[PDB]
């Protein structure tokens, strides 16, 4: 099966827009622990730190899962 609606990474990001209007669904009280009031840009626009670069380049697995192997 082939997809009719396809968006590459840059396309998804191109379509991001800061909208301070919070979806009503997220204004439920039971989602206060996870509500981000001020909209955040995609992490894709945030450059890696030196640590992030090292980890994503060499080792990403937790010590716990490596403890089994």
């Amino acid at each position: 099966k082939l997809a009719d609606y396809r968006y590459g990474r840059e396309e998804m990001l191109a379509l991001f827009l800061k909208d301070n209007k919070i979806p009503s669904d997220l204004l439920d009280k039971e989602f206060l622990p996870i509500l981000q009031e001020e909209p955040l840009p995609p992490l894709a626009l945030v450059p890696f730190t030196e640590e992030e670069q090292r980890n994503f380049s060499m080792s990403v697995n937790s010590a716990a899962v490596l403890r089994l192997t």
Binding site: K1, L2, A3, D4, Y5, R6, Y7, G8, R9, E11, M12, L13, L15, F16, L17, K18, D19, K21, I22, P23, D25, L26, D28, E30, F31, P33, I34, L35, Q36, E37, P39, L40, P41, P42, L43, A44, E51, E52, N55, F56, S57, M58, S59, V60, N61, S62, A63, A64, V65, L66, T69
Partner: protein, 163 residues
Amino acid sequence: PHMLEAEHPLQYNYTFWYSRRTPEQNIKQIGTFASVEQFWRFYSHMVRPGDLTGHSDFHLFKEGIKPMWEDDANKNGGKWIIRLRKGLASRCWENLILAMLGEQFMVGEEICGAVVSVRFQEDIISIWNKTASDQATTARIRDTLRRVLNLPPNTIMEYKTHT
């Protein structure tokens, strides 16, 4: 999930869910969206996974698919599991859901959804597919995760089923 003509539809409607184990892992539906613009309205107003406190999880499944193992679409399905060191899950979650929503996995309708689980000393990224016995789809998804999450070659991944 009303949809406007100006915004960009997704191949499927998707539903965000949220669960926290409180001294209890009961999954709660946040809401459903249908376009790329609608997705960003939810995601950009959700705390990042890495900033969640305690035994917490985000789920992102196709509308109508329940993120539990009692759902029929999941009785014969499986999931790829990546157990990550702390500090990586937020970026992997974003890259994963962007590729899933973008239909970059190229496996028809086999995808059910994605989950990021925040734990004490590790984070767990997973993606569920319809048919676990589908070794053809299970392999494509694995190779796609590798490229889409930019996993180092020796990254450990596990495919779990219910049998």
